[PDB]
C-alpha cells in the first residue's frame, strides 16, 4: 500500500528532476550539482576568499558535517571555484577532513575567529575544533583529537549559535529541556574540558532552535516544540522566566533567524506548513504568515546582501525564497495561479529532504544546499528575476 | 626398401607473440622458377614467408586484424582468372571469410554467412573461383568470388549432428568428403546437372541488371553416410584418387572406400552402408583435437605431426601400404604439439607449425 | 489504416498524455518552478522591483498596527397558523457574586410587517467584547396580533443553527413561524513516417493538455520542447504546422542514511528500417525484395524428398503403388485440403493435374484402388469416383 | 578370411596409376597459367621474427590493419517446417505382368493400414499407428488382376452390373454377370473403437478430459462429441462455443461462419481458422538487441491477432528431458511443453518464431489449440505491435 505509493512518487520525482535538469539553462547564472561521499546535515560558507588576478574564477570555502553509519565521521572543510563575471569550468575539492566524535547535527563557525568551529554530537558532549592546529589529513586510527570539549546537556539536539559581539559566548540546545551557554574565553589553554557556564530551563518541550540577537548581546531568542517562542534577557538573574513568551505558531516550531540589516525584525519556520514574520517591539501580533511550503520546515536564513529577502526549506524537496517588498501586492490572475506574489523562487532541483542551506557573505544572491541523499548543490539566480 | 629421403632440419623460427598456430598452406598455384612463398597464422596474426636454399626465410608480409579476440584457423592460396594475381583466403572464430590481395595489401573482399567459427577452407582445383568453407555450425558452404555470391550449402537435416571439422575435394573436382565430431564421413557431388547449372547461373548473376535474390540450391541429402569407420572425433579427411584417407584420436590413419572393393565410386547409392578397410597406418600420441596431415601436388608421400614434436613421414609410390616403410623425424627442441604440415609443389620443401609459435623446416638432400 | 497501428498510436499517446494530465494537477497544486521566473516566459509577471528601493522593514509594524486600529441577514417569512414580528438579541452573561440571577439584556433591533395564514440586517453587532462576559447570545422573535428564543451563540463561539430557510415554533404568554438565516496552430502526428492523424488547434495558443495562456508562439514552442520531453516537436510556417514524433531514447532511470560515491555534475556557468537476413541462407536481404517473393511459403523440397524416401524404404509395397503414393503426396502438399467435402473436388484436380503423368506410367488401376481406399473411409461418394474416372478416360482416349 | 591382400595391392597400384595420370593432366592444365608474384611494401604497430638457428637476422615489418566487419550471434543449423513431426504373400502390382488373384481384405491391406484419416496422406509424420480396421466397414478371359478388380468393385457396389460395365469399359455387363453367376459358394487426442457400445467411462476420450470429434467411429447421436460453432460473425469472442474450450473452428461443422468456402482467396469472415488455412504473417529474421537472434514482423497486428504458430518435433517427456540434458552443454533450449503426453523440441527444425527470447515485459503469448485433434501451438499478440518490433513471450 505505502511501498508502491513511495515507488511511484520516486518515479514522479525522477521525472520532475529530469525536467529540472532540462529546464535549468534559463533560470540560474551558476549551477553546481555535487555529491559527497557521506551526506551533510550542515553547510556553511566562510568569510575567507581568494581572487587570483590571472584567473577569472574566485575561490570560496565551505564547512560541512557528516552523518554516517558503521564508518568514521569526517568533518569536511572543502573549497569551491565560483566564476565571478565571465566564463564550463570549476570543480569541488576537499581540503581538510577531521575525525569527529560520532555523527554531526549542527556546526557553526565563530564570526570573530573563523578558525574556531563549534560542532554538536549525538551525545551530551558537544565540542569545538580549530583546524589551524590540526593536520591537513585525518587519523586512520579513528581516535579523534577534540580541541575544546563542552558539556552540560544530557542529550543530543540541533541548536547552536555563536555570539557575534562577545568572544567565546556560545549557545546550544538539546531535547532534554535545557539550553546551555558557555564562554570559552575564560578557560586557560591547558583546560580542554569546560563545564556549563549557565543552563536555562523555561520551556516544557523539545527546544529546537536558539540564536543570539545581533546588535544587542544582552539577550537571545529561542523556539521550541511547545508551539512557543521565548526571548530571554541575559541581564536577568532568573533562568526560568523569559523576557517575552509567545504562542507564535499552531504546531511545533522548528527554526528561527534574525535580520542582518535590521535588529528588531525576525523570522521563524514551523511544522504547521508555514513561515512567519515577527518583530521584537510587539511580539503579540502576528505580522504575516507565508504559506506555500507543504511539510515541516527545517531551516530559514536571512540573506546577507539584502534586507527584504527570506529563505526556507524542509522535507518538501523544494527550497522556497521570498521577497518581503513584494508582499500584499496585486498581480495578474495567471501570475497568482503559480503562487503568491511575495514568493520569489522555488528551487526544486533536489530529490530528497533538504537538510540544510546557507548564504555566502560576499557574493550576490548565491546559496548552497545539502540534502540527506548525498547531494550538495550551489546556485545563483538570474539577474533578470530580481534585477 | 630403405628410407630414400635425406631430410635435415634447415631452420626453426619462433615468433614474438607466443600463441599457438593453427594452419599453414603453400602457394601451389604459383608458376615454376619464381621465388616460392607460404604463410602461417596464429590467433589474430597471419604472416607470409619466403624460402631459399640456405634456410633464409625472408619475411614478405604480415597482416593483423583490429579485433584481437578473433582466432584464425586455416589459410589457402588461389589465383584469379582475369587479373592473374594471387589471393590469400583466411577465416577465424568471428564467422568471417576474408580474401586478401597481397599485391595491394588490403582486404579486397569478405563474405559472412556462418554463425560460429570456421574450421577449414578449400578451393575447387580446376575452376579456381569456387570456395568451400567448413564451420562449427553443423553445415558447410560454397561461395563464388568472381561474382561475389553464394552457390550452395552442403548441409541440412541429414548433415552432421555435431561440429564439422574438415572437408576436401577430389583432385578432378567432382566429389567432396566431409568429416566432423559427429562420427560421420559424408560424401557430396558437384558433377550432377543441378550443381552445374546452379554454378552457371551463379556466374551469370548480376544485382545491377536484374532485381531478384539468388536461388540458393540447398542439399539436405548426401550420397553416402557411415558411422562405423571411427568411434572418437575425426580431425581430418582427404582423397587419394577414388579412396578416402582419414584420421582420429585413436592414433591410426585408415585408408578405405565406400562399398565393396569392386563397387565403383561414381555409382554409390544414398542407402549404401557397407565399407572396405583397405589399409591402416600406425602411430602414437595424437590425443589432442584439431590435428592435420598433408600431401604434395603429386601426392607421392604423406606427412603428419604428433602432440610431442616427433613428426612422421610415409611413402605412397611403393606398393604394400600397410607394409610400407615409415620414417620418423625428431629434434631436441620441438617441445610442443604440431598442428599441420605442408610441402611446396614439388616434394623438396617441408614446413610444419606448432603450438609454441614455432615454425620448423626440412629439405631433401 | 488497419486498427493495429491505430491502437498502438492511441496507447503511445495515451500513456505520456496520461502522465502529463497527472502532472498538470500536480504542478497546479504543487508547482516545481514558477513560470514567471523563466526568461522566455516573463509576460505572466505584472510588476517590477520599484517598491524594493523605497521599502523599509523596520517601518512595517506601524502598518499592521493601524490594521489593528458576520453579516446576519435575518429574513422573515409567512407564518403557519389558523402578523408583524420583531427580532431581538438576548445576551445572557455570567453570574456575578453579588447577584443571584444571571444578567440578561434584550436589545430589540426593529419590527416589520409580515403576512400570515421583511428582513433585518446586522453588520457584526455581537458586542461581546471578548472580555469573558457574554455567556450566550440568543435570537428572540417577538410577535402579536407567540414569543420564543433560540440559542444562537454556543459556549465555544460556535454557531448552532444552520443557514438558509428554517422554521420555529412559539408559545404565547401547528402554530409556528418561518424565517431565513444567513451569516491557428495545427498538430500533425507522425509515427513511422505515417500521417496517422491531422488536426487543427481550437484556441490560438492555449496549450492542449497543460492549458496555459501564453501570448507568444516562441514561448509555446520552447515549452513544448523543454517540458513534455517524451515527444519531439518541429515547426515550419505552413498553414501553423507542428510535427510531433515519439522520442524512443528517453532517460528513464531512478536518478537518485546510505553511502554513495562522489560525483560533480555541472551543466551551466554562462549560457521498418533495420536490416534483415534470410531464414535458410542467413544472407543479407535487400530492401527492394521484401514483400515480393515471401519466404516460408511454397513448402521446401526436403520435405518432398523425405516423403519420397520414407515410403520408398517400405519393403512390402509395389512399384506403381509407391508411384501413385508419391503423386498423391505431392498433390496434397501442393494444395492443402483439410475439409472433407473438398476432397470430392481434390480427386477432380488430380486427373486435371497429373492425369497425363499416369497415362505415361500406366497407374490408373492403382489410382482407382486409392480412390476406393479413400471411399472406404466415407470421405467421398461413389458416383463422384465414376465421374472422375470417366473424365480421366475421356481425355486419355 | 584374408583372401584380399593381393586384391588390395592390385587396387592400390591401380589407384596410384589413375591418380598419377590425374595429377599429370592437372599439371598440364596448371602449366598454361601465368600469374604474377607477391610484392611487399617499403618498410602504428610492428612485428618482428627472430631465428633460433644462428646465421639469420631478426626480420622486422610494420603492421597492416584489415577492414572491420559486423559480427552476428551463434546459430546452429536447421531447416524450415510448416507441419509437426514425430520420431520414435507379396501381392504384386496390379498393372504388372505377374499379377495374381487376391481377396479384397488382403489387397487393400497396405493402403488401409498406411492411409491416414486426419491428414489424407500415407505414412505421415504425426500419426504412428492406425486406429482399427473396422473404421471403414459399412452396412470370357479373366486374369487374377481382373478377378481382384471385380471383387472389390462388386464389394463396394453389391452387384450393380451396369456400374462395373461403365467403370471398366472393356468388360461388358453380360460378361461380368456371367462371371458373378459362377463366383458364389491435457492429453493428446486418440480415436477409440467402440461402435456397438455407447460412449461410456471405459472410452479413453472421457479419460483424457477431451470431447470426441468426427474422426471417432462412435455413435453419431452421442453427446460427448463437440459440435461446431454457429456464429455468423468472426467468432473471435468468448461467447463462441469453440472459444470456451481450447478448440478452434471446424471446416465441415462450422457452416454458419463460412469456413467451408474456397481457400484460394484470403478475405474471409471466420477469424479463427487461420491455423488450418495458414494465413500467417510474413515474419523475418534479425539479430535481437537482448540475447542473440530474434524475429521481426513485417505488417502490423492487433490485440489477440494471429501472428504465427510454433512447430517442431513431438517427443515424450523423458525424451525431451534427455534432449535438454544433451543441449545443456550448448545452452540452446528452445523447448516448449505442449501437454502431459507429448512436448515440442524445435532446436533442429522449426520456424522464425522460435528465435524470440524471454523478458519480464512480453508482448506476445502462446495458446494450445486442438485443430482436428492435433494439439498445435498458436502464437498470438497480447498487445498491438508495430512492424520491425521485437516479439517476446514467456515459455
Ligand atoms: Zn498426418
Ligand atoms: Zn467417445
Ligand atoms: Zn463419442
Ligand atoms: Zn470416442
Ligand atoms: Zn467459432
Ligand atoms: Zn467456425
Ligand atoms: Zn466461426
Swiss-Prot record, chain A:
Subcellular location: Nucleus; Chromosome, Telomere
Any single GO CC term annotated in Swiss-Prot or TrEMBL for this entry: ATPase complex
Recorded consequence of changing residue 372 to A: Decreased interaction with ZNF827
GO BP annotations, alphabetical order: brain development; chromatin remodeling; DNA repair; DNA replication; DNA replication-dependent chromatin assembly; negative regulation of cell migration; negative regulation of cell population proliferation; negative regulation of DNA-templated transcription
Protein keywords: Acetylation, Cell cycle, Chaperone, Chromatin regulator, Chromosome, DNA damage, DNA repair, DNA replication, Isopeptide bond, Nucleus, Phosphoprotein, Repeat, Repressor, Telomere, Transcription, Transcription regulation, Ubl conjugation, WD repeat
GO molecular function, one term: RNA polymerase II cis-regulatory region sequence-specific DNA binding
Coiled-coil segments on the chain, per record: none
Tissue expression from the record: Expressed in neuroblastoma cells.
SMART domains, per the entry: WD40
Modified residues (N6-acetyllysine): 137
Positions of modified residues (Phosphoserine): 332
The organism's place on the tree of life at top rank: Eukaryota
Residues joined by cross-link Glycyl lysine isopeptide (Lys-Gly) (interchain with G-Cter in SUMO2): 137
Chief location category: nucleus
WD repeat start and end residues: 28-102, 103-152, 153-200, 202-247, 248-291, 292-348, 349-381
Annotated region described as Interaction with ARMC12, given as residue ranges: 1-109
Consequence the record notes for mutating residue 158 to A: Loss of interaction with ZNF827 and loss of localization to telomeres
A family per Pfam: WD40
InterPro entries found in the cross-reference section: G-protein_beta_WD-40_rep, Histone-bd_RBBP4-like_N, WD40/YVTN_repeat-like_dom_sf, WD40_repeat_CS, WD40_repeat_dom_sf, WD40_rpt, WD_repeat_RBAP46/RBAP48/MSI1
Similarity-based family: Belongs to the WD repeat RBAP46/RBAP48/MSI1 family.
Full protein name: Histone-binding protein RBBP4
Organism of provenance: Homo sapiens (Human)
Phylogenetic lineage: Eukaryota, Metazoa, Chordata, Craniata, Vertebrata
The encoding gene: RBBP4
From Swiss-Prot, chain B:
Keywords in alphabetical order: Acetylation, Chromatin regulator, Chromosome, Disease variant, Host-virus interaction, Methylation, Nucleus, Phosphoprotein, Repeat, Repressor, Transcription, Transcription regulation, WD repeat
GO terms (BP aspect): cellular response to leukemia inhibitory factor; facultative heterochromatin formation; genomic imprinting; heterochromatin formation; negative regulation of DNA-templated transcription; negative regulation of transcription by RNA polymerase II; oligodendrocyte differentiation; regulation of adaxial/abaxial pattern formation
Lineage top rank: taxon: Eukaryota
Inducing stimuli: Expression is induced by E2F1, E2F2 and E2F3.
Main location: nucleus
Gene Ontology CC terms, in alphabetical order: chromatin silencing complex; cytosol; ESC/E(Z) complex; nucleoplasm; nucleus; pronucleus; sex chromatin
Entry domain remark: The WD repeat domain mediates recognition of trimethylated histone peptides at the consensus sequence Ala-Arg-Lys-Ser. This is achieved through an aromatic cage encircling the methyllysine, and involving Phe-22, Tyr-73 and Tyr-290.
Protein name, as recorded: Polycomb protein EED
Full-sequence range covered: 76 to 440 of 441
UniProtKB/Swiss-Prot annotation, chain C:
Cellular location(s): Nucleus
Region: VEFS-box, residue numbers: 274-350
Keywords of this entry: Chromatin regulator, Chromosomal rearrangement, Disease variant, Intellectual disability, Isopeptide bond, Metal-binding, Nucleus, Phosphoprotein, Proto-oncogene, Repressor, Transcription, Transcription regulation, Ubl conjugation, Zinc, Zinc-finger
MF GO annotations: chromatin DNA binding; enzyme activator activity; histone H3K9me2/3 reader activity; lncRNA binding; promoter-specific chromatin binding; RNA polymerase II cis-regulatory region sequence-specific DNA binding; transcription corepressor binding; zinc ion binding
Expression tissues: Overexpressed in breast and colon cancer.
Source organism, top-level taxon: Eukaryota
PTM annotation: Sumoylated, probably by PIAS2.
Protein name per Swiss-Prot or TrEMBL: Polycomb protein SUZ12
Swiss-Prot record, chain D:
UniProt cross-references to PROSITE patterns, sorted A to Z: CXC, SET
One of the GO biological process terms: hippocampus development
Catalytic activity: L-lysyl(27)-[histone H3] + 3 S-adenosyl-L-methionine = N(6),N(6),N(6)-trimethyl-L-lysyl(27)-[histone H3] + 3 S-adenosyl-L-homocysteine + 3 H(+)
Cytoplasm listed as a keyword: no
Primary location: nucleus
Phenotype upon changing residue 358 to A: Loss of methyltransferase activity
PANTHER family documented for this protein: HISTONE-LYSINE N-METHYLTRANSFERASE E(Z) (PTHR45747), HISTONE-LYSINE N-METHYLTRANSFERASE EZH1 (PTHR45747:SF1)
Family: Belongs to the class V-like SAM-binding methyltransferase superfamily. Histone-lysine methyltransferase family. EZ subfamily.
Protein name: Histone-lysine N-methyltransferase EZH1
Source organism phylogeny: Eukaryota, Metazoa, Chordata, Craniata, Vertebrata
